[PDB]
């Protein structure tokens, strides 16, 4: 049970992420008794249903999914449309619509299209809200991608001093299917995941939508840059380590001069 669960999670880390849905299907076919555990750990990738009455292609998650009935973040139409289930507060319903519109604009601010849906479900001292953003790949080019922004905010409003504790769950996926000749059949999928706390003020000028949107902006750019620098420079070092371009015996004399530098360091210190 636990041995298969742990080996399954680390195996998903080891398995090719291009088949995550099919890999998980193969995993359920292997051990179906640990199906929901792996579904809870590794959530579903971004699926899109259409809010036909509102004309909104909306992302699919666990929270909108009333059982197995995906709530639209605009019309609250389940998929299949049920009558009772995933329901935020009425004020939270309208606030959710506002947040969805503004974050669709955010998706246009960084993606200039795509599908994004934020789902909310009220609670007393704050609540939890899942933030989702999906974008396709460069169809105009040889590089393909499947943007999978999976985010969950831990809204914890504090009545004292109108602040609100937040801890946005971070999880972003995208493909780097660059099939360029200079890149070869190069593909990469950053199955990223982070989270960090903050207590932000909720006001008329800084409401929940604005607060969380700012944190989203911050977190996304930070993680994205962290990948681009740390991970990609690291892979560059890996590229140089597996295959060096410079022939040796050239670097040897340079290292001998390096030894002489250390010698001089000892000559003075």
């Amino acid at each position: 049970s636990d041995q298969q669960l742990d080996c399954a999670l680390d195996l998903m880390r080891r398995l090719p992420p291009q088949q995550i849905e099919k890999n998980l299907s193969d995993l359920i076919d292997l051990v179906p008794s640990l199906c929901e555990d792996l579904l809870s750990s590794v959530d579903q990738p971004l699926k899109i249903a259409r809010d036909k009455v509102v004309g909104k292609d909306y992302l699919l998650c666990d929270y909108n999914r009333d059982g197995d009935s995906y709530r639209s973040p605009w019309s609250n139409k389940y998929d299949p449309p049920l009558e009772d289930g995933a329901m935020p507060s009425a004020r939270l319903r309208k606030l959710e619509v506002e947040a969805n519109n503004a974050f669709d604009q955010y998706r246009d601010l960084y993606f200039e299209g795509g599908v994004s849906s934020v789902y909310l479900w009220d609670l007393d001292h704050g609540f939890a809200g899942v933030i989702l953003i999906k974008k396709a790949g460069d169809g105009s080019k040889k590089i393909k991608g499947c943007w999978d922004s999976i985010h969950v905010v831990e809204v914890q409003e504090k009545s004292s001093g109108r602040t609100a504790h937040y801890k946005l769950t971070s999880t972003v996926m995208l493909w780097l299917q660059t099939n360029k000749s200079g890149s070869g059949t190069m593909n990469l999928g950053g199955s990223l995941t982070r989270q960090m706390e903050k207590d932000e003020t909720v006001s008329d000028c800084s409401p929940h939508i604005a607060n969380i949107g700012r944190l989203v902006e911050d977190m996304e750019n930070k993680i994205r840059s962290t990948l681009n620098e740390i991970y990609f420079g690291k892979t560059k070092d890996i590229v140089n380590g597996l295959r060096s371009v410079q022939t040796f015996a050239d670097k040897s004399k340079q290292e001998a001069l390096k030894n002489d530098l250390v010698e001089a360091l000892k000559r003075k210190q």
Partner: protein, 370 residues
């Protein structure tokens, strides 16, 4: 060659130059190109008119001063050569290229083209027989004597975190950003553009940079110190013109931490430094935590390193012992190390002779640089 080797402290904002053995660069004057602004009429009006130094600082309002080292990269190549001739002149060197050995320094992530063009100067126009283009961060390590240190320069158009190991950095874990106090001070002037101060000349802006070096700092609390209302301390121009300062003094350096103030595709040089350190082994990161070296000139603000410390505490994990060395000749730390390496006579193999250029050009430098 049996002469005192020339050390060239390639400062972005303030370039310097000197020799071996010394601790302060023999001749100091910043990096700029001061072109004229009028036409000679009276016999007594000097000629050449693209003056540097005493005439520049003297007649700031008469010289259209420009800057070649844009983004830490010289654009007025030929003019910089003539600035070296200004150094070669009776003012600073009083010698020739062919006489003294020379040592050029460099920042990380530099394009080869600049190095090649420089070598063209060095061995064609100038004809130094003993010269090689070295780095700058390792020179600050020579100054500190440290081995596993992170060097952070602070110039005008360059900012780089260099995680070094015994004077031999991982040429991959190093990060480099080509922006500092130039546009930051321009942005501070932009703050004053809102309050009516668009005094556009660079020499007129040199005064603003004198304020940058003088009436500016880094408040650790970002919004708690920015959103409040200041006292607007006054400043007086060379004539003594009253100009208030306000919050701008610490608002503008936030650009280095929040590039969104100018819209730069950077992420805060502090985070970039964190990432420069994070591109190595954890224990090597510990060694770099123990040795944090600062260079350049913009390392002279109040709460500069303090706000940096706070940022690292809010970003880096636990137990990160941020041991930041705070020397004073951070500008000259690179020069100090150049004088140190210049004193090292092992440089014979490390240099590039004139015939070495004749047979390799700059390929020899690219084969010997690290």
């Amino acid at each position: 060659i049996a002469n005192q080797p020339v050390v060239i402290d390639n400062g972005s904002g303030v370039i310097k130059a000197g020799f071996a053995g010394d601790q302060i660069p023999k001749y100091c004057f910043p990096n700029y190109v001061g072109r004229p602004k009028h036409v000679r009429v009276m016999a007594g009006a000097l000629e050449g008119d693209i003056f540097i130094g005493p005439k520049a600082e003297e007649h700031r309002g008469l010289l259209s001063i420009r800057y070649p080292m844009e983004h830490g990269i010289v654009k007025d190549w030929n003019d910089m050569e003539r600035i070296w001739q200004y150094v070669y002149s009776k003012d600073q060197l009083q010698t020739f290229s062919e006489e003294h050995p020379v040592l050029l320094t460099e920042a990380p992530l530099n394009p080869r083209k600049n190095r090649e063009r420089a070598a063209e100067v060095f061995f064609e126009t100038f004809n130094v027989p003993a010269l090689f283009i070295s780095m700058q961060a390792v020179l600050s390590l020579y100054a500190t004597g440290r081995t596993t240190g992170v060097v952070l320069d602070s110039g005008d158009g360059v900012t780089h975190a260099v995680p070094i190991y015994e004077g031999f950095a991982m040429p991959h874990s190093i990060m480099r950003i080509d922006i500092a106090g130039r546009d930051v001070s321009r942005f501070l002037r932009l703050y004053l553009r809102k309050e009516g101060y668009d005094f556009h000349s660079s020499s007129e802006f040199e005064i603003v940079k004198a304020i940058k070096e003088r009436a500016c700092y880094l408040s650790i609390n970002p919004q708690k110190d920015e959103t409040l209302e200041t006292e607007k301390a006054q400043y007086y121009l060379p004539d003594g013109s009253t100009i208030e300062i306000g919050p701008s003094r610490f608002r503008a350096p936030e650009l280095l931490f929040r590039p969104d103030l100018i819209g730069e595709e950077s992420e805060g040089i502090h985070e970039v430094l964190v990432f420069a350190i994070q591109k190595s082994d954890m224990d090597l990161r510990r060694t770099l935590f123990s040795n944090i070296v600062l260079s350049g000139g913009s390392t002279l603000f109040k709460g500069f390193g303090d706000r940096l410390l706070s940022e690292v505490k809010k970003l880096a994990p636990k137990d990160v012992k941020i041991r930041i060395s705070a020397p004073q000749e951070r500008l000259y730390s690179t020069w100090i190390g150049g004088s140190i390496l210049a004193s090292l006579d092992t440089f014979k193999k490390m240099w590039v002779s004139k015939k070495e250029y004749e047979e390799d050009g700059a390929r020899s430098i690219h084969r010997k640089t690290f």
